[PDB]
Swiss-Prot record, chains A, B, C:
Protein name as annotated: Membrane-associated protein slr1513
Induction and repression of expression: By limited inorganic carbon availability.
Main location group: membrane
Keywords: Cell membrane, Membrane, Thylakoid
Places the protein is found: Cellular thylakoid membrane; Cell membrane
GO-annotated biological processes: regulation of nitrogen utilization
Pfam families named among the record's database cross-references: P-II
This protein's record includes keyword 4Fe-4S: no
InterPro entries membership: N-reg_PII, N-reg_PII-like_a/b, N-reg_PII/ATP_PRibTrfase_C
One GO location term (cellular component): plasma membrane-derived thylakoid membrane
GO terms of molecular function: enzyme regulator activity
Membrane topology: Peripheral membrane protein
Length: 95, 95, 95
């Protein structure tokens, strides 16, 4: 039972590569992405689990500052506990 | 860090327009929708962030009463904090 | 307002049937599944609401032990309250 912060980013489809690049540079182990609708126009949704709150805010602050003046989008955070995940918890395990 | 209520509605694909219409009339700023499976048959999932609990229940109570006697579906709620989002937090920001 | 445990499983696409079969045998009422990306390669995401914590861990422990030595994936849990859902709450309702 390793606690975690689930960061969610919903925004326009064009930024996929731009946001994916930012997530990799933050220190996050991995992420999930999926095609969605919004209002209905096609857009994307990122889901990133992070060990610390600070890392989650670091990802949100950069994406918002860089693109949210021009492009539409929303970013929010949820509490979670990771039970299994080699990259997130390590070979040691989530215990 | 503006607190929010994440309302989730999973139900049959036919109701997309019917449920989308209800969400707009509730006072919710926007929503996300996506194609999913369930048991596997194709169905839809709505995700709505709301400022108050009452608004979330207002959306759930109407959709359930109107369609859940006939159609299959589930509605649940999650705690969240919106970090960035112009429509949800306003030009003032989520602070 | 019936409390629930939202179990989420993200893993490789091949295991869809293998994991779907396990979820059915656990005692979970139903589930949601959807095509997603991850890092970008195509993969799947399961979402299972469960009445007890023990049932959620039972599903996670079996899937992890059986496939997570070979295949990549992450499993985490979120708090939630089910407002409407005939299969989850019964004909009595979520109250």
């Amino acid at each position: 039972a390793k606690p975690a912060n689930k960061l969610v980013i919903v925004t326009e489809k064009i930024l996929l590569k731009k946001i994916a690049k930012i997530i990799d540079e933050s220190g996050a182990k991995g992420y999930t992405v999926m095609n969605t609708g919004g209002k209905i126009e096609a857009n994307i949704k990122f889901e990133i689990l992070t060990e610390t709150r600070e890392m989650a805010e670091e990802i949100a602050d950069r994406v918002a500052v860089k693109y949210f003046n021009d492009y539409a989008g929303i970013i929010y955070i949820c509490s979670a506990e990771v039970l299994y995940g080699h990259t997130f918890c390590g070979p040691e395990g989530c215990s």
